[PDB]
Design an enzyme around this catalytic site. Structure first.
Site, mmCIF file in Angstrom:
data_model
loop_
_atom_site.group_PDB
_atom_site.id
_atom_site.type_symbol
_atom_site.label_atom_id
_atom_site.label_comp_id
_atom_site.label_asym_id
_atom_site.label_seq_id
_atom_site.Cartn_x
_atom_site.Cartn_y
_atom_site.Cartn_z
ATOM 1 N N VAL A 26 0.831 -1.200 0.000
ATOM 2 C CA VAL A 26 0.000 0.000 0.000
ATOM 3 C C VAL A 26 0.876 1.266 0.000
ATOM 4 O O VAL A 26 0.406 2.365 0.287
ATOM 5 C CB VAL A 26 -1.094 -0.008 1.093
ATOM 6 C CG1 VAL A 26 -2.207 -0.984 0.731
ATOM 7 C CG2 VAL A 26 -0.516 -0.306 2.478
ATOM 8 N N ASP A 162 2.794 8.051 12.565
ATOM 9 C CA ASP A 162 4.136 8.530 12.303
ATOM 10 C C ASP A 162 4.599 9.750 13.097
ATOM 11 O O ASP A 162 5.483 10.472 12.638
ATOM 12 C CB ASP A 162 4.278 8.767 10.784
ATOM 13 C CG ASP A 162 4.073 7.474 9.975
ATOM 14 O OD1 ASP A 162 4.288 6.372 10.532
ATOM 15 O OD2 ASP A 162 3.722 7.565 8.796
HETATM 16 C C1 LIG Z 1 2.403 -0.436 10.488
HETATM 17 C C2 LIG Z 1 2.831 0.837 11.180
HETATM 18 C C3 LIG Z 1 3.940 0.855 12.029
HETATM 19 C C4 LIG Z 1 4.315 1.998 12.716
HETATM 20 C C5 LIG Z 1 3.593 3.179 12.566
HETATM 21 C C6 LIG Z 1 3.854 4.473 13.281
HETATM 22 O O1 LIG Z 1 2.990 5.354 13.310
HETATM 23 N N1 LIG Z 1 5.056 4.628 13.874
HETATM 24 C C7 LIG Z 1 5.420 5.838 14.616
HETATM 25 C C8 LIG Z 1 4.607 6.196 15.813
HETATM 26 C C9 LIG Z 1 6.002 5.687 15.980
HETATM 27 C C10 LIG Z 1 2.494 3.190 11.710
HETATM 28 C C11 LIG Z 1 2.104 2.031 11.042
HETATM 29 N N2 LIG Z 1 0.962 2.061 10.210
HETATM 30 C C12 LIG Z 1 0.974 2.561 8.967
HETATM 31 O O2 LIG Z 1 1.962 3.093 8.441
HETATM 32 C C13 LIG Z 1 -0.323 2.562 8.271
HETATM 33 C C14 LIG Z 1 -1.644 2.369 8.642
HETATM 34 C C15 LIG Z 1 -2.552 2.585 7.590
HETATM 35 C C16 LIG Z 1 -1.938 2.969 6.410
HETATM 36 C C17 LIG Z 1 -2.522 3.296 5.096
HETATM 37 C C18 LIG Z 1 -2.065 2.625 3.960
HETATM 38 C C19 LIG Z 1 -2.591 2.917 2.709
HETATM 39 C C20 LIG Z 1 -3.578 3.872 2.572
HETATM 40 C C21 LIG Z 1 -4.034 4.565 3.681
HETATM 41 C C22 LIG Z 1 -3.497 4.277 4.929
HETATM 42 CL CL1 LIG Z 1 -4.037 5.206 6.282
HETATM 43 S S1 LIG Z 1 -0.220 3.066 6.621
#
Ligand SMILES: Cc1ccc(C(=O)NC2CC2)cc1NC(=O)c1ccc(-c2ccccc2Cl)s1
Length: 338
Positions: A26, A162
């Site tokens: 994705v 993030d």
């Molecule tokens: C799997 C993952 C691991 C870590 C973090 C994170 O936030 N780390 C920092 C805080 C420390 C976020 C995710 N989720 C993601 O990166 C996603 C969830 C949904 C996603 C998505 C994918 C395609 C289209 C729309 C969305 Cl929202 S990407």
């Protein structure tokens, strides 16, 4: 140990427990590529991120640890939560890959069809501020908040992604002017500036400050909020930043009621409070939640703060293998949420 299976996705091997099925890329996430997947244990649609070369540089090894520590601590409805963390490695000596699992949600807030209705904006912004109150209470800031890192499901429920990771060939449409100009007189309200930019865009259907470059970005901001006043200029330590400001044409502050025509007057008032150039005067996440704009959503008894968060590692300069061993300890001690 669960049974793992291998496959090639994004010109790299993904080795995950059989539990995660139908991996579909994705796009990229923060410091890694993300796949949508089906979790056969919970029946939930998840996002699985494979960190890129997590321990192949000191910067990478420390950021790997930083991210996993953050994810393991943050437990809030409007903040992305860690569902699982795994490695195909059977020992510390073979530990080279880290995979992180969260809810997929479905979409982000980032081509545009139309404006959002006022109740839709209230609910979305309320959720962002509720999540920011929690993150900020752990002495964590996003620093790069934008529509693409706000994950929403079909019911408009939102989770911030993030945060806590960030610290000119890209647009910086939501960035606080004080981070851009490296003043560096800033605080947690850098994220409130970003919320203001997002809220404005949700209400109007247009990017508030679509700067073409770093120079144009500041010009567009100052066109709305006006050039810094004497009270603000006194607080800038940086000679380089101060010189830059004076070299620019003196711009008056615009009345936001004339910019956001037709918007709820309470939305306009909140925007005035969020888009203050002086970060010492900018509204905080907790203060913004109490603003009359959120009267239908605000519940002071249900806007929780984080448990104390130990971030002392931030001041440490350790070797790759030390960051790797600390990360490995965190992976093995992880307990999934109910
Ligand atoms: C799997 C993952 C691991 C870590 C973090 C994170 O936030 N780390 C920092 C805080 C420390 C976020 C995710 N989720 C993601 O990166 C996603 C969830 C949904 C996603 C998505 C994918 C395609 C289209 C729309 C969305 Cl929202 S990407």
């Amino acid at each position: 140990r669960p049974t793992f299976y291998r496959q090639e996705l994004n010109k790299t091997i993904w080795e995950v427990p059989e539990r995660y099925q139908n991996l579909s890329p994705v796009g990229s996430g923060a410091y890694g590529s993300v796949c949508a997947a089906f979790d056969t244990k919970t029946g939930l649609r998840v996002a699985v991120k494979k960190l890129s070369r997590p321990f192949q540089s000191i910067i990478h090894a420390k950021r790997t640890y930083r991210e996993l520590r953050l994810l393991k601590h943050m437990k809030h409805e409007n903040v992305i939560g860690l569902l699982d963390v795994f490695t195909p490695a059977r020992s510390l000596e073979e530990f080279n890959d880290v995979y992180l699992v969260t809810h997929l949600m479905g979409a982000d807030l980032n081509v545009k069809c139309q404006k959002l209705t006022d109740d839709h904006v209230q609910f979305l912004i309320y959720q962002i501020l509720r999540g920011l109150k929690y993150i900020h209470s752990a002495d964590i800031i996003h620093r790069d908040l934008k529509p693409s890192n706000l994950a929403v499901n079909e019911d408009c429920e939102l989770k911030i992604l993030d945060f806590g990771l960030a610290r000119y060939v890209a647009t910086r449409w939501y960035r606080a002017p004080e981070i851009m100009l490296n003043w560096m007189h800033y605080n947690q309200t850098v994220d409130i500036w970003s919320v203001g930019c997002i809220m404005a865009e949700l209400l109007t259907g247009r990017t508030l400050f679509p700067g073409t470059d770093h120079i144009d970005q500041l010009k567009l901001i100052l066109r709305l909020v006006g050039t810094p006043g004497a009270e603000l200029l006194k607080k800038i330590s940086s000679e380089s930043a101060r010189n830059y400001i004076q070299s620019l044409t003196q711009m008056p502050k615009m009345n936001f009621a004339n910019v956001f025509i037709g918007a709820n007057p309470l939305a306009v008032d909140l925007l005035e409070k969020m888009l203050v150039l002086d970060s010492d005067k900018r509204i905080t996440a907790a203060q913004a939640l109490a603003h009359a704009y959120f009267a239908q959503y605000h519940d002071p008894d249900d806007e929780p703060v984080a448990d104390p968060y130990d971030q002392s590692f931030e001041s440490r300069d350790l070797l790759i293998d030390e960051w790797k061993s600390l990360t490995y300890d965190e992976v093995i001690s992880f307990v999934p949420p109910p």
